[PDB]
Design a protein around this ligand. Structure first.
Ligand SMILES: [Zn+2]
Ligand SMILES: [Zn+2]
Ligand SMILES: [Zn+2]
Ligand SMILES: [Zn+2]
Ligand SMILES: [Zn+2]
Ligand SMILES: [Zn+2]
Ligand SMILES: [Zn+2]
Length: 89
């Protein structure tokens, strides 16, 4: 589910980053690194929490490209479509 995925990924990134869900969403196209924090440890943690929410295996080596909220959402959608679990409109 499109809404469900975009909101779930937002919540996870908000947690890991200790930022507010509305701000992270407003900054959905910001670069994850430098432009506000998020390093390889935080990206690693984002990946792991997504691989718990949605029950989804993500070979854990994209973090270099877990690079914005919208990129991260897109990654989650791709992986959900691989798994036969995406309803996309
Ligand atoms: Zn619905
Ligand atoms: Zn949307
Ligand atoms: Zn803290
Ligand atoms: Zn708040
Ligand atoms: Zn966008
Ligand atoms: Zn660090
Ligand atoms: Zn896995």
């Amino acid at each position: 589910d499109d809404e469900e995925i975009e909101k779930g990924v937002t919540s996870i990134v908000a947690e890991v980053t200790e930022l507010d869900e509305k701000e992270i969403w407003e900054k959905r196209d910001a670069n994850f690194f430098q432009d506000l924090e998020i390093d390889s440890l935080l990206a690693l943690e984002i990946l792991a929490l997504i691989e718990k929410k949605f029950k989804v295996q993500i070979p854990e080596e994209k973090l270099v490209d877990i690079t914005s909220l919208s990129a991260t959402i897109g990654l989650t959608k791709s992986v959900l479509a691989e798994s036969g679990k995406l309803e996309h409109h």
